[PDB]
């Protein structure tokens, strides 16, 4: 089975080592995605900030 093969890859010492190092820095990945979610959910505000900034340079 192909799913069996992914489990087989997970056994690989080198694959496992890399996956473990990814889970060691999963907090950083989580925070960067949370930061991106924040940036996206405040994208309208950042757009209004760039609008007020350009609008000042217009005046």
């Amino acid at each position: 089975s192909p799913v069996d093969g992914i489990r087989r890859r997970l056994d690989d010492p080198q694959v496992a080592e890399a996956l473990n190092s990814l889970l060691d820095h999963a907090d950083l990945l989580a925070v960067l995605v949370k930061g991106l979610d924040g940036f996206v959910r405040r994208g309208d505000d950042i757009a209004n900030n760039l609008t007020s900034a350009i609008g000042e340079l217009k005046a």
Partner: protein, 322 residues
């Protein structure tokens, strides 16, 4: 040109919309354009055995059937018997089989007939399907390879209901020798109506361009585009709703109602699942899940940010003022 108009799992909204026809109006279409309306459940004089005589003569080839218009879904339940739609002594689906096989042209009017529409929403108790489609999947009741005697597939005049012109202008074209001018898209819809989008001619496209959202219904719709907060499917829906106005007056989007994408085979989209009605599904609260047709989320969002920055003051104010 004889026309037999049957209704399966229909609400008759396509007929009523059709009766709103202007230029031509329905009476002038039926009388003055050489279209002999053999029968229509809402308009035919014959009842009972006289009506059945008309139907059987059409089905068996005793009299010519040039256009078979079918409105409503092909109801197959229960258990494929179609007895949830018994018409004139037969399951309506059997009538559909016979008459679609007899007609020179078969026209499915309205999503129900074209694609299954609202009755085909899960759990689809009536076993409803379209003539040649079930939602987007080609084949429906008649099969993907069905062709009428003029060689055409089922002409899908979608909508829920179809606008009167979407059928009447096709009927006029057929009656005036312009059948060859009729081109059909991949959903068998007349491209003369369905190359445009609902958004095409929408009074709110400038707000769309500048990503100015209508925020609320009622007076809130004096400004803004409905795409961002109300799930307007205008930019993802092929229709001339804003080109050829409804009732010669308006369109949903002009009026402040989001386009529900009813000319699209998936209608009702998302099966009206909770949270999808008059709402834009968004990723991370700001990226629409569905972007306009032919755009990708990356470009669309980049252009949207640029437009929000460039947006002129009038795009942020009421425009459909008293």
């Amino acid at each position: 040109a004889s026309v037999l108009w049957f209704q399966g799992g229909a609400c008759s909204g396509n007929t009523m919309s059709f009766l709103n026809a202007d230029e031509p109006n329905v009476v002038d279409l039926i009388v003055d354009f050489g279209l002999d309306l053999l029968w229509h459940p809402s308009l035919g004089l014959e009842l009972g055995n006289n009506a059945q005589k008309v139907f059987w003569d059409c089905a068996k080839g005793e009299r010519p059937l040039d256009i078979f218009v079918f409105e409503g879904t092909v109801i197959e339940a229960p258990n494929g018997t179609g007895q949830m739609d018994m018409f004139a002594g037969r399951p309506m689906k059997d009538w559909v089989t016979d008459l679609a096989g007899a007609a020179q042209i078969v026209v499915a009017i309205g999503d129900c007939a074209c694609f299954g529409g609202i009755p085909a929403m899960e759990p689809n108790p009536s076993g409803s399907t379209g003539l040649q489609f079930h939602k987007r999947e080609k084949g429906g009741f008649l099969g993907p390879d069905f062709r009428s005697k003029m060689g055409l597939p089922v002409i899908n005049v979608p909508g829920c209901p179809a606008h009167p012109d979407w059928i009447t202008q096709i009927l006029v074209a057929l009656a005036t020798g312009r059948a060859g001018d009729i081109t059909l898209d991949d959903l068998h819809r007349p491209e003369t109506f369905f190359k445009t989008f609902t958004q095409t001619g929408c009074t709110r496209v400038q707000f769309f361009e500048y990503k100015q959202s209508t925020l609320s219904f009622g007076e809130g719709t004096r400004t803004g585009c409905l795409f961002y907060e109300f799930g307007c499917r205008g930019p993802m829906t092929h229709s001339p709703c804003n080109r050829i106005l409804w009732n010669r007056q308006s369109s949903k989007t002009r009026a402040g109602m989001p386009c529900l994408g009813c000319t699209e085979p998936e209608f009702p989209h998302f099966d009206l699942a909770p949270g999808t009605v008059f709402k834009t599904q968004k990723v991370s609260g700001m990226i629409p899940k569905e972007v306009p047709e032919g755009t990708d989320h990356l470009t669309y969002m980049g252009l949207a940010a640029a437009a929000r920055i460039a947006a002129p003051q009038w795009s942020k104010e009421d425009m459909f003022v008293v």
